[PDB]
Amino acid sequence: KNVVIYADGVYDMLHLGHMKQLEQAKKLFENTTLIVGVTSDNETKLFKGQVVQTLEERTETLKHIRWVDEIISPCPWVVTPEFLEKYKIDYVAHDDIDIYAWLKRAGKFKATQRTEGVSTTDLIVRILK
Amino acid sequence: KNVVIYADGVYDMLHLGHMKQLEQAKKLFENTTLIVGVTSDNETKLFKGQVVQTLEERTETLKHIRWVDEIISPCPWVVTPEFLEKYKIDYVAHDDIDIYAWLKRAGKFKATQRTEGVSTTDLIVRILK
Numbered sequence A, B: 001k002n003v004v005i006y007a008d009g010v011y012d013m014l015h016l017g018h019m020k021q022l023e024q025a026k027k028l029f030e031n032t033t034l035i036v037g038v039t040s041d042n043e044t045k046l047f048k049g050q051v052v053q054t055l056e057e058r059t060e061t062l063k064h065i066r067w068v069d070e071i072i073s074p075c076p077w078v079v080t081p082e083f084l085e086k087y088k089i090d091y092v093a094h095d096d097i098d099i100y101a102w103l104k105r106a107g108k109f110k111a112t113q114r115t116e117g118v119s120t121t122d123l124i125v126r127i128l129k
């Protein structure tokens, strides 16, 4: 009955968009365990860009989110089949833009939706107006 | 056994300081219900200053916090004895600077600690440096 869901990301300056994504992932099935992977400072710098918050900060905030059952911090930058076996993960949940093609082929990918206009930085834009 | 705790505030741009306060309030006793009061846009404008986020936004974010059992939105600007009776509140939890003197006299005030340097706006200061 219980299904293990994995959602990875940077989760920098956690905002309502992230929280709604985690809620979505958590409620994909009736009984789930949501594991959240948080990306390292270095790989995030190397591949995405600057992070405002450190791994420790990004991880500590996530701990306070209702839908989060377990956190893997740091998590691998790229998901692998071996990683899924190690953590008994049934599905990977993430927005859908292919780096996830192999997960889709395996029937282990659950797409989630982004929430626009709600980021921490969009809120700063308000203040300046 | 179960104890009802009430924590009120603005909770604008929710950050780790708020989340740690709510965790503190929630863990004041072994078995609690944490009710969170969120202040109205008008009274917050009148008495504190501008709020970035609306009541609806401030409330929606709080919903995603693990420690929150119930939300009263909007909540009264000032706590009264009648309000405590209506919601069967045992203790009010808030930082300690006296507007809370009457609660302290009644044995219904539990002080919580602020967390410094961790606000959403302090994180914006980082980016600019």
Ligand SMILES: Nc1ccn([C@@H]2O[C@H](COP(=O)(O)O)[C@@H](O)[C@H]2O)c(=O)n1
Binding pocket: A007, A008, A009, A010, A011, A012, A017, A018, A020, A021, A093, A094, A095, A112, A113, A114, A115, A116, A117, A118, A119
């Ligand atoms: N506005 C946003 C921003 C991110 N998200 C989701 O939060 C998760 C982590 O995103 P980041 O790695 O960009 O922090 C991803 O699944 C992403 O789709 C969202 O659903 N809405």
Ligand SMILES: Nc1ccn([C@@H]2O[C@H](COP(=O)(O)O)[C@@H](O)[C@H]2O)c(=O)n1
Binding pocket: B007, B008, B009, B010, B011, B012, B017, B018, B020, B021, B093, B094, B095, B112, B113, B114, B115, B116, B117, B118, B119
């Ligand atoms: N840095 C901060 C900011 C607020 N808080 C707490 O969060 C609650 C709500 O604070 P505000 O009304 O300022 O949003 C209060 O109990 C306050 O003490 C905190 O513990 N640390």
